[PDB]
Assembly symmetry: D3
Homo-oligomer: 223 residues x 6
């Protein structure tokens, strides 16, 4: 397996939006690697979350950690420009949400960001065949985004995705989001995931550091 170093990406949807900078500082001080950014436009999913200004506010506040913007929006091209200027690090989108996937991935790369494709539980991986050189991260949803129980079939899709990336020779992260907890993160990594989104499991816990410490402990006795 030509994987990448493990990374924990809390989704700030579970964070305190009245004290966002403080809450992000606390989870990063607790050892988190990536700030995960769930953007919903009330159309691709039945919910509306936060826009590029929140990414801007985090950068102006001092957050230099990588910000991983997951676009659950459609169409994607215009708002991609705003997240590039707002300081996003990763920009990922669903292939179903863009009429021209290649041009959309190229738009992110030409902005200096790392680009990715997000796969709904039912979405097959076939669309990756002709954009392998243009995706830096692959996100598999283990729940239906925007609507809370881990879909077990995702483990098979994680293993298929890990195989596809390994045979490409390119450095591509395998990200997972949806029902990720301490009790299953060991099994999830064994399927081939190297980038882990957790939300409630971290931000709603009484101690962020122990939970992250518990996750990394399980991740070591996983591979």
């Amino acid at each position: 397996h030509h994987m990448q170093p493990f990374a924990i990406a809390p989704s700030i949807l579970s964070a305190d939006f009245a004290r966002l900078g403080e809450d992000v500082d606390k989870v990063l001080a607790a050892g988190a690697d990536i700030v995960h950014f769930d953007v919903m436009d009330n159309h691709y999913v039945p919910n509306l979350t936060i826009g590029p200004m929140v990414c801007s506010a985090l950068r102006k506040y001092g957050v230099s950690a990588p910000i991983d913007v997951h676009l659950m929006v459609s169409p994607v091209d215009r708002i991609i420009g705003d997240f590039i200027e707002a300081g996003a690090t990763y920009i990922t989108f669903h292939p179903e949400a863009s009429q021209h996937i290649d041009r959309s991935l190229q738009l992110i790369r030409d902005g200096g960001c790392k680009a990715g494709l997000v796969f709904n539980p039912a979405t097959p991986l076939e669309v990756l065949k002709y954009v392998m050189d243009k995706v830096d991260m692959v996100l598999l949803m283990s729940v239906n985004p925007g609507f809370q129980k881990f879909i077990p079939g995702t483990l098979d899709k994680l293993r298929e995705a890990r195989a596809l990336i390994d045979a490409s020779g390119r450095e591509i992260r395998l990200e997972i989001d949806g029902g990720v907890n301490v009790k299953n993160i060991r099994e999830i990594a064994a399927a081939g995931a190297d980038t882990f989104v957790a939300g409630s499991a971290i931000f709603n816990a009484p101690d962020y550091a122990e939970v992250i410490r518990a996750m990394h402990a399980e991740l070591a006795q996983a591979h």
Copy 2:
């Protein structure tokens, strides 16, 4: 002073210009500085070319302790589903654009049945004719003096403010007249004199070095607005 059927003046800062890294703190300062209403600009990247903040941020302000009335301006389309979320999130006012709903009456009724005050937002070009048959169901009328989601006060709004003020005055209903777009200390007197009683300002307050001084200066002009 005057004979209009108005409501007591209210200053409604737009938290679009606030510090989203310290939002609860920033809202506390503007409220402690004399602001009345927290104005909430909700944009869904479809009705306007921008995406701002959803109901979870309104919930976060309520869970933090913000008890001031929260004025949710919906620049989204369609509106009914997200209207429910802002009701459950603790919004006080919910206003939306007539163009954004296929069924304006049902949408207004949805807000009222939540216990909220309802309103219609008017783009610079949108005429006021649609108010004729919903006068009993609007608690506030928001006049946009700029194109929402895109930056200079459009002067013709003063004429529409006067037209809106006249419709409310002759209606017998208690309806707030709100204005948003380029409202600052140098023009708030003329805007109030045109008939607005609810004033949304954004950068003028949140980008100022002292929030209380600016708000006092606004009230200074509002006092000399009906000579």
Copy 3:
């Protein structure tokens, strides 16, 4: 200057397992017009019945005028099918058509009578330049597709009656939403001459008594 009173029950409240039977009974009970509520799950959050049901009633023997209310968007394609299906009136919402005049003209060219439907909030302004092409004006007293009569509708009825009277043309003034025996008198006095009732008729045990009761209130005008 009005048009003769007409009672137009909406078959949304009828028995779709015995539809021909129920329509015969309500018509034999004195109903004038069969009102047809078409919803496309887009313009309103519900899906009801399409032109094949209008077609099925015509093949069954129903010769009464069938009044097709389109709560759909866009409208031009399905207008054609309802022309071929044997519709008598075809009405649609001005917001649902990008080209109101062409859509009204499309109905007239099929031989049907055309109308525009106005949501509770919709002002009557759009009638100014199409008065020659509407045979019926339908005012919604409830939000279509979603149930209590909106009182402000009576004010719009009187404004609508004034516009029709000043046109000199034969245009029906229709009302739909919460119309019952207890209010049909005031609704007619406001200027309505065409009355859609649904639950009030089809859920009653005897159709003839309700319609006879309604005309009694229409008599005290």
Copy 4:
């Protein structure tokens, strides 16, 4: 590893002026499932019948399984209504839902059986990660909503039956579009176990003879 043969007449060809009577006759003539073609004027250029008609069939006494084929987009809201309306199967096209799994999960959580419908050109790959959530697979042998059996459907039937056979799950393989007595044997031999016919049954003078003829050819299939 197929399922018991089932004949599912499509009531688009039935008499909607005497629908309860017409359905009783086809059911008394040996039909197994009432097939329900729902069109929203957007996903296909036609509008047929909504949940109230399914309700009317239940309120009239029809206890047979009602198989609702949703040719609509989006699907989630009307799915809820058909669950309450008393549907037995609810199927939809994968292209018509932005979130296929949540839509399938919606049907199952209502107590209904769920399925995916595939247009003549639509490939079967999308079933790979939803095999546990589909109870029926419907292949269209004509373009839905627009009348001759597309011959390539037999090959897709054989491919679909293999996928279901290799899954170990109880999933019906349904076919709809130009299915008649003269071709139902070959269709069944291709792997279908649920057969939608419309005009072939409801436009016939005796429903029982046509249905009887279909079962005769279904025997001389495999």
Copy 5:
């Protein structure tokens, strides 16, 4: 009546697109004032006509006359930019086709172009009240656009339109389009129109100049 000098604006949909430059030269040399450009995007109307490249092609060829682009498209803002760079003189659009009429009108003005609003046969004139300072032309459709006989009520709307312009004090052209010929141009002008779009009446005539002279002859026996 604060009108503008009469202008004949033949619409090139009736022109020979195999010999467009030649045909435009002839109709202008025959006395036409404005080249009328009908843009349809197959969505706002059931037809697709010509885009900005044809406006560019006429300018690259030498056409210096004012080019009047009527946008029957929705949305309008993106293609407004392209018609500005392509060299349009007027850009007009339908208010129903823009979610933000004022911003769209301002976009045209900021490109250096003249702006306008187009009214379908049923569209009321009410929307002009708060954009009078931003419209240089008002186009009244006397037929349903994109689908051929003058709708008689348009004459009443012209008089209503002319009265609104007269009361504004602004230099605003009153344009008419749909079934305009020599036999009715006098009555149309007396109702208050000062800019006349004709298509087949001119381009299908054997001599373009004779028709234009006849139209200009009828315009004299107007007011």
Copy 6:
């Protein structure tokens, strides 16, 4: 394969003298007049509609006209291009809710039908419509937005294999950054129908460029 064919795209032609320019490119040896139709929705541009195809036929153009539809939805305008005299009509599968019916509409009109594949679009959708496609167009750039995407060669070879294994007569068309310096390799990948725009219509002499292209097509 099919005999090599050069299909200049009239997006690069002179729309003020279109009949003349099309006459010149055909007299210079071009085989097919390529027609790029954009509706400002499927792609961020609006080009030319059926009236222009009709105008070319009324002018005398009897050559095959290849209409590539970058529009969505497609069925209504397919009807218009049939009336206008189109020879090929191709569309993107993502732009039609019912691909088979749309291909069938073209075939029932007497035209040849095809499917266009965006750079990211896989070829999987061809499996059940192989009997209904006369041409397969591979986009080597993002349509409507100009440099040849290298992965297209891999898809060309994969597509050529699918057609070769089908036994059906289907043209393999390529569009996007096709020039004299790369047309040999593209044909070697399996393409037999070549769309060029600027390379031909912006050249000072159309005949020399087309002659130069055919020379490279020979050493394939």
